[PDB]
């Protein structure tokens, strides 16, 4: 086509989706990770995670308002990844890298798994 | 913070939101523009448009599944802008620029209004 493109559009959309999340506006699911709960938008979760894409395209699970993650999933690891989904920013630290990588593998977030593997290999 | 950032994340999220829209997955509103209907995600509309941000933060309108636009709004103009919202690509042409600009003014999409004004000024 003969379209023009607004460079910052995708980033501005994501910034606004994060603002809606912070104000709990039109959030439609709560992700339970052991004793912790995280409110989010199903569409954003599906757009970032192979696991959520599978869950919310399921004819029964698409209608659930609560999703319980595997008890082995670390809440801080999940929190860091949920923040990444809404911002493109990953708070990767020596103290959380193992939990972040395990959570990214479970959530099926290949690019996060890739940078975790690379950061781990550099430290060995 | 000490975060790392994935450059393509925002663009990949938007590409997936557009794929969900094309397959009518978790779309939660229909925008009626005279004889035409457009299915979309309320969160994406709010993230792109001052008008939709106002509508869906309203305590009564947030729950509506159908929104009827002003009868002066051109469906093709709306279609071009809805595509822009989900892709960052604006199909701006001599034959549609007036309708696109009027629709962008109504929807409160300042960056689109700005490029339309500039393209119009260049042709006079």
């Amino acid at each position: 086509d003969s379209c023009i493109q607004f460079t910052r559009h995708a980033s501005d959309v994501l910034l606004n989706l994060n603002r809606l999340r912070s104000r709990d506006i039109l959030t439609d699911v709560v992700i339970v990770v052991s004793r912790e709960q995280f409110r989010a938008h199903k569409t954003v979760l599906m757009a970032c995670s192979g696991l959520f894409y599978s869950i919310f395209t399921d004819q029964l699970k698409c209608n659930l308002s609560v999703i319980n993650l595997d008890p082995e999933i670390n809440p801080e690891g999940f929190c860091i990844l949920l923040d990444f989904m809404y911002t493109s920013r990953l708070n990767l630290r020596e103290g959380n890298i193992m939990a972040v990588m395990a959570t990214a593998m479970y959530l099926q977030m290949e690019h996060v798994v890739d940078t975790c593997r690379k950061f781990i290999k550099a430290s060995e | 913070d000490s975060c790392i950032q994935f450059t393509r994340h925002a663009s990949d999220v938007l590409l997936n939101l557009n794929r969900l829209r094309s397959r009518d997955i978790l779309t939660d509103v229909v925008i009626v523009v005279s004889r035409e209907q457009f299915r979309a995600h309320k969160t994406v509309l709010m993230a792109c448009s001052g008008l939709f941000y106002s509508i869906f933060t309203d305590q009564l309108k947030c729950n509506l599944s159908v929104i009827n636009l002003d009868p002066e709004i051109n469906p093709e103009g709306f279609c071009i802008l809805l595509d822009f919202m989900y892709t960052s690509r604006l199909n701006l042409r001599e034959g549609n620029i007036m309708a696109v600009m009027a629709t962008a003014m109504y929807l409160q999409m300042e960056h689109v209004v700005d490029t339309c004004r500039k393209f119009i000024k260049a042709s006079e």
Partner: peptide, 4 residues
């Protein structure tokens, strides 16, 4: 705005 750019030519993509």
């Amino acid at each position: 705005w750019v030519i993509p």
